[PDB]
């Protein structure tokens, strides 16, 4: 079903995908193999279709998480880079491809959550949460505040919760245990009691969400935020003179930010297995490769270390590193769906007062 | 605080491998007389991992690390460093270094110590 002798890529909308057809044409010149880069509409949904039918692209490019269902179901190949090659990118990144003990895509770029701060209202932002109810009562006093992020979803609110102790599901050894979840133990406790907190003693809002913050930062009203690579942009066309950095800790220890990488998956159904492990490894997880994408749309941080040390002389790319090596990669597993709800309806509960902390979290538990 | 610990060297590692720790002690340090490493797994205990008695270079290691780590002084630089090989997933932690002049009980006993750095993390895939 799927043509034997060209390669069919498909990426989607929001990614360089202009810039990975400009490495499909260097695979050209040196091979004759014709590589079609794609950007097809609703590809999240698209690709499991077409490819439980033994149709679809020879390589997929997705988020790491949804390819462990992927690889369940049957639609994705077993990948076999050498020890070489596997070194040439860093350790906890090919954890994140991993499902059922075996290397199930190649990763690309790595993404998640950093400390964004305004560096005229706060040239020195603060290395722990513990600072933070001090540097707001000082920044209250001019009008200003000193943190706004969207506390609505738990993507945001589980770096500080599960800082000391919290995690989503057990990984050991290649293999998530959906029978041990750290949701309700002392570390998560103490995570939310301080977000909690916060919001008691009026450093924070219990109805700040994505935009409330967005705006509050972009117009020089709070001097810190938390968010992604992908709300860069819209703090360059504010003007404001922001820093990317660490999150702050908590007990001392990091807060742990869920990590997605963006990974590059072999279709089940390829003829072409061998060539396109030869245009992954050999092209596309190169410097060369990694820039002519980077070049169209911005990759943020990526697996591949000879070229992160390139793009890490931004340091808000170094920041998105440090703090994706800190943090927990999502799980890549359907019983986060569970995770999800059950973590939102906790905080909710907590941050408007209808539970107590440990009750929220002894249900989110269960 | 006039001494002032700083790690550095932490990251992520493969089983197997080895990975070198920092610390860079400043300030008045001329009385210091042990160095510790340890390790603290979020929510867990802090546990001793290496300690040197810098006045004769003898060392101490906890039994998961003999044999594998190493924990040596650099007096030309005032940096103590933690050499981690043969590295494994139960060795993922944040190392903390700490510092002191002289004390009553086990050098491997965080309450032995006085000076604490803020930690670098160490996190071993399988």
């Known amino acids: 079903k799927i043509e034997e002798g060209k390669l069919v890529i498909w990426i989607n909308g929001d990614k360089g995908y202009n810039g990975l057809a400009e490495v499909g044409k260097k695979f050209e010149k040196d091979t004759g193999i014709k590589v079609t880069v794609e950007h097809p509409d609703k590809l999240e949904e698209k690709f499991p279709q077409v490819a439980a039918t033994g149709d679809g692209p020879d390589i997929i490019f997705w988020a790491h998480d949804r390819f462990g269902g992927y690889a369940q179901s049957g639609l994705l190949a077993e990948i076999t880079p050498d020890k070489a090659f596997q070194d040439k990118l860093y350790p906890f990144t090919w954890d994140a491809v991993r499902y059922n003990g075996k290397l199930i895509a190649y990763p690309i770029a790595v993404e998640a959550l950093s400390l964004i701060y305004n560096k005229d209202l706060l040239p020195n932002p603060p290395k722990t949460w513990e600072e933070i109810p001090a540097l707001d009562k000082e920044l209250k006093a001019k009008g200003k505040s000193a943190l706004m992020f969207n506390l609505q979803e738990p993507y945001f609110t589980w770096p500080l919760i599960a800082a000391d102790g919290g995690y989503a599901f057990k990984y050991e050894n290649g293999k998530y245990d959906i029978k041990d979840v750290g949701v309700d133990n002392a570390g998560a406790k103490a995570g939310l009691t301080f977000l909690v907190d916060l919001i008691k003693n009026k450093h924070m809002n219990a109805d700040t969400d994505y935009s409330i913050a967005e705006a509050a930062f972009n117009k020089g009203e709070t001097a810190m935020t938390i968010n992604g690579p992908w709300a860069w942009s819209n703090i360059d066309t504010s003007k404001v003179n922001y820093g990317v950095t660490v999150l702050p800790t908590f007990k001392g220890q990091p807060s742990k930010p869920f990590v997605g990488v963006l990974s590059a998956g072999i279709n089940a159904a390829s003829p072409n297995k061998e060539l396109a492990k030869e245009f992954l490894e050999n092209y596309l997880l190169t410097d060369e490769g990694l820039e002519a994408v980077n070049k169209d749309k911005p990759l943020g941080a990526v697996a591949l270390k000879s070229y992160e040390e390139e793009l890490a002389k931004d340091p808000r790319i170094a920041a998105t590193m440090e703090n994706a090596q800190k943090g927990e990669i999502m799980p890549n597993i359907p019983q986060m769906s569970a995770f999800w709800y059950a973590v939102r309806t906790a905080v909710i509960n907590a941050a408007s007062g209808r539970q107590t902390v440990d009750e929220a979290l002894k249900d989110a538990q269960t | 605080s006039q001494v002032q610990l700083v790690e550095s060297g932490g990251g992520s590692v493969q089983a197997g491998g080895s990975l070198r720790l920092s610390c860079v002690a400043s300030?008045?340090?001329?009385?210091?007389?042990?160095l510790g490493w340890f390790r603290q797994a979020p929510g867990k205990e802090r546990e001793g991992v290496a300690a040197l008695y810098t006045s004769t270079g003898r060392t101490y290691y906890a039994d998961s690390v003999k044999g594998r780590f190493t924990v040596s002084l650099d007096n030309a630089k005032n940096t103590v460093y933690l050499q981690m090989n043969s590295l494994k997933p139960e060795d993922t932690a944040l190392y903390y270094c700490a510092a002191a002049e002289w004390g009553s009980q086990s050098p491997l006993t965080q309450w032995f110590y006085r000076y604490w750095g803020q930690g670098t993390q160490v996190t071993v895939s399988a």
């Open positions: 300030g008045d340090i001329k009385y210091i007389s042990y």
